[PDB]
Amino acid sequence: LRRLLVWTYDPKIRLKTLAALVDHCQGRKGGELASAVHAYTKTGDPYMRSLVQHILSLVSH
Amino acid sequence: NLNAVRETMDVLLEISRILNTGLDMETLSICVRLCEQGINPEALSSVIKELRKATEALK
Amino acid sequence: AAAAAANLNAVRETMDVLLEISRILNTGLDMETLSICVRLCEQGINPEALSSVIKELRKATEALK
Amino acid sequence: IRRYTDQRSLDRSFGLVGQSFCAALHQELREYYRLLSVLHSQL
Amino acid sequence: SITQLFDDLCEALLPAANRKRAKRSLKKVAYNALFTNLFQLPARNKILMLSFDLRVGGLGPKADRLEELVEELEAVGSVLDLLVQLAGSGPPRDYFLNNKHVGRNVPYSGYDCDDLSVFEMDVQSLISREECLCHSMIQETLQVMEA
Amino acid sequence: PVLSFLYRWIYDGELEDTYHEFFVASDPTVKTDRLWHDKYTLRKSMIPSFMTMDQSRKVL
Amino acid sequence: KSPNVLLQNLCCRILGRSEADVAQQFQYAVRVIGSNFAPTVERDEFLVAEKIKKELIRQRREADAALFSELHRKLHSQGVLKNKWSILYLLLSLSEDPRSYATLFAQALPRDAHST
Amino acid sequence: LVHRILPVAASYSAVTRFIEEKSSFEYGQVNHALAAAMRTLVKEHLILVSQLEQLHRQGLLSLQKLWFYIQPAMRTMDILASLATSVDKGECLGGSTLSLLHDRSFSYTGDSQAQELCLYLTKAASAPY
Amino acid sequence: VAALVVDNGSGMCKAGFAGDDAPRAVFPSIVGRPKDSYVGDEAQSKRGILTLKYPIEHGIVTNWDDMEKIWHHTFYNELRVAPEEHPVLLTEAPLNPKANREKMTQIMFETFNTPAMYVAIQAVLSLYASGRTTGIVLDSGDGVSHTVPIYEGYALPHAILRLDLAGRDLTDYLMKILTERGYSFTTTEEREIVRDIKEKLCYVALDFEQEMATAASSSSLEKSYELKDGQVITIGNERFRCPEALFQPSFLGMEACGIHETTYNSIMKCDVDIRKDLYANTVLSGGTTMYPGIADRMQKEITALAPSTMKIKIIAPPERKYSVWIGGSILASLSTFQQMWISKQEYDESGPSIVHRKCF
Q1: DSSP H15-26
Q2: Are I252 and I260 in contact (CB under 8 A)?
């Protein structure tokens, strides 16, 4: 089904977000890592905003 | 008063549309005026279902 | 035919076996309501749904007393 | 009709009435392509 | 009015153009059906029965529309009884629909994938209708050649 | 298009055609009280012939 | 018969009342059973038997937890009920202790892992 | 006939790169939500091209039929690619890109099947602003 | 086998044919002779000699030979009527005639000699135009009526609203009541002009207090009937005087209770499976349904009769003067209307000519 391209297309936004959140948070910890994702909450794209709002609501606990 | 009856005929259109009845705005408009005289609605349904069979049978 | 008795008896039994399982569980169900519920469940239906509704309708019924 | 609607879907100046007209022409022309496929079907 | 409503309803049911005495024949069919029947569970409950078996087939918001579009008649029970008893009879897109990339505070969900094979069956419908239509055209003009 | 101008102009006094197309052509300037006397012409080349001149005057 | 009228009769048995008056409750029930209708969870029975024995044993009613094991054999001997799971699951879900972790234990496998 | 249908490929090409690039945190919140809304139409295009190859494996699809089936895509990609380049060259890399959508939306007031695609994008991308 | 009709629910006629929407001949019930034989309106012009003795009374035949006179009248004189060649249907009075039924059945047996026939139950035959199985049978012209149709046919009514007045009986009294209203209308030649005055200008009778107020206290008065046909003053005040018949026994020439309250009492003296269920969808005909608009006061009295009104509604079609015959036409011309059928030697062995024995 388009040699998969139809189905991967939605994962391929989440994985690109997570790898690019990981390389950005690399080496930090504590409140310096809870801050490091609060950076990514400032974005228009409401799809990416939903992941990072969830992940920060975990890490902020 | 009167425009309440037209919008009544918009409710009684769209619900007849989603209930997928075969009806049209002329037959709807008269069927409510028959119901206002107290005529039996299942009896009306019995004439309406058989009249569409004859309507085709004329071809 | 006799098969209208032979199968009806199997229903008389499968219904009161189940009336036992439902009383060892101390549930509130009468004989009739259980028969509605298994008639539903044999059609295919998701038990989580009506099991929640049965408690909700009970809540309404008792809260008005 | 194709060269006409090209030279009127190019350049913005033709106005809203010009657009709806060439939109109608595209739509009524669209079926003529369907028919040509029904013909192209034959061997 | 009373008898005149059966008169022109028969004219509405009669098709657009022998446009003469059939108009009496059909009236007799109407009277027959009416009086062979007459000599021989309210509306809200009735429509919920139809609300439900809509809501199981798909098409849930339509079913929602039905019940909200008629809770409004509290300020016509016999009129509704027409539509339900005639309900089967009839003759046989959005972008904001099921789209996570738009709107404001969309909550977390993770992959639906059924909302994709849904979307993929719509597009299969819009190719399959236009193949069955091409079959119904090619047979038509070829038949009168072969006949 | 032409009714999408008219059915707004009949309720709300605004117009936006870039390449000119609607018949109630406003001229620029004369924004003072003289607006009532002068500002809105009636473009004779562009009344759609499914309406009369009188109608194009009533909506003006 | 058909699920909608059965569901109405259900309402009329738990409620102490007649058919026309309870139509808002039937409206709520139609909203809730509707959509929640396909099998959400992969359904098999070795599990739903264990999940009840465990609860009877927890209550120290250890004999009933062996009576169940034979009532279930009888219910399965007769060949009538083809969807046993649902009515066991329903009765389990309705059960009450005659007198909270819930997540560490074995659970129903989620079915979302397959497509149709 | 091939050259006649190829402009939808280049029309797609230019919006894959638009959606990719204008996601980045430089470009303000609005340019993201515009690049976001457009993903939907890449899915629909990809879905389309899948089914036509499935048809082609049956032998039941011909280049003249492809030229029929492609026609809604031909329009709806060009309505987007000609919007992307207007944000590139315009550098409307802030709240000002809503002006470009509002003007383009009003321009298509004649066109319905094209006007909803443009009304969708301004209904979407304006939300952050 | 295109069936004919008679529709004589009172002193009136309605020659139905082939199930058409209206009867052809609609003359009032009269015969010929002091010319040797004629029909009613034709022989009524020569008033010096040629007249009729009301061969139909207000509600029923005056003598047994008057039915054969009506058979030899426009039922054979007019509209090419020939009962040997196609069926015909006869009306009836409340609870039917007996001697006139036997004589008219003998006329259908041997004189007109029709191989196919229908008879009786005209007040229930109105139900085919009333559009419901239960109802109320205020459904006749001329001088008499009684509103007792059916529960679902079956000759079992619950509403029994008869009275010593009717839709044209009260009109003939109100024609002479212009002289009782002080106008110069006591002459016999004014009965033709006052038949068109007191049935047209006497519109919409109302409640008694408003009718007493509008006659003298308010500036309603009457219409400007200063015509040369014999009109001195109109019956617009007589519309307000008509509550003395519609709500009083003897103040405007009747014998029973006033026509709203008597119908209310006779609809109260009833069973519960009918009457209320009859008034949920009942519908009138004749001079009662073709009334000048005074039926709203009867509907108000029908609301005031029972506090548990049960949504009582009674319909009234404009075409009601023909619809008492058209209802007959439907009720006879269905594809299964053989409940009151008489016929040829397949049914004439027991005799068509019986009063109530064979034809039932």
Answers
A1: HHHHHHHTTSGG
A2: no
| Cβ(H120)–Cβ(H37) below 8 Å | yes
Q: Which two tokens stand for residue B33?
A: 């005026």
Q: Are G18 and G26 in contact (CB under 8 A)?
A: no
Tokens coding H62: 């011909």
Write the burial class of residue C12 (CB in 10 Å: 0-12 exposed, 13-18 middle, 19+ buried).
exposed
Quick one: DSSP state of residue I24?
Answer: S
The count of other CB atoms within 10 Å of the CB of residue I52 is 22
Tokens of H45: 């295009």
Cα–Cα dist B29/E9, whole Å? 10
The tokens describing I182, both together, are 């002080």
C-alpha span between B19 and E48 (Å, rounded): 12
How far apart are the C-alpha atoms of I118 and I99, rounded to whole Å? 17
Give the residue carrying structure tokens 């790898």: A19
Token pair, residue H47, equals 């879905």
The token pair that represents B18 in the structure block? 């989603």
Instruction: Please list every residue in chain F whose beta carbon sits closer than 8 Å to the beta carbon of residue H109.
Output: 1, 4
Nearest to E48 among G23, G37, G115 (CB): G23
| Alpha-carbon span E107 to A47, nearest angstrom | 9
The CA distance from C25 to the nearest CA of chain G, in Å, is 5
State phi, psi for I117 to the nearest 5 degrees. -160, 165
Collapsing DSSP states into helix, strand and coil, what is residue B53?
helix
The DSSP output letter for I294 is T
Q: Coil, helix or strand for I115?
A: coil
| Orientation of helix G3-14 relative to helix C47-63, angle to 10° | 30
DSSP I56: B
- Give CA I21 to chain center in angstroms: 18
Chain G residue with CA closest to E48: the answer is G27
Q: Residue A35: how many CB atoms within 10 A of its CB? A: 13
Q: Which helix (H) or strand (E) holds I116?
A: strand I116-118
3-state SS assignment for residue I4: strand
d(CA G25, CA G11): 8
Q: Is D20 on the interface with F (CB under 8 A)?
A: yes
Q: Determine the Cα–Cα distance for residues I289 and I326; give it in Å rounded to an integer.
A: 14
The two structure tokens encoding residue I25:
């001949």
Q: F21 and F46 in contact (C-beta within 8 Å)?
A: yes
Integer Cα distance of G77 and G111 in angstroms = 28
CA-to-CA dists, residue G38 to C34, G44, H31, I210, angstroms:
21, 15, 41, 69
Expt. technique: cryo-EM
Cα atoms in the Cβ-side hemisphere of radius 13 Å centred on I298: 28
Q: Distance between CA atoms of E119 and G59, rounded to whole angstroms?
A: 50
The three-state secondary structure class of I39 is strand
What gap in Å lies between CA E96 and CA E115, rounded to an integer?
13
Residues on chain I touching E39 (C-beta within 8 angstroms): 133, 152-153
Phi, psi of I277, rounded to the nearest 5 degrees: -70, -25
I342 strand-pairing partners: I117
CA of G22: how far to CAs of B49, E41, E80, in Å? 32, 12, 19
In our burial notation (b when 16+ CB lie closer than 10 A, e otherwise), range H34-63 reads bbbbbbbbbbbbbbbbbbeeebeeeeebee
Report the distance separating Cα D26 and Cα B9, nearest Å.
37
Q: From chain F, pick out residues whose CB is under 8 angstroms from the CB of H110.
A: 1, 4
Q: Give the burial string for I243-265 (b: 16+ CB within 10 Å, else e).
A: bbbbbebeebbbeebbbbbbbbe
Residues in chain B: 59
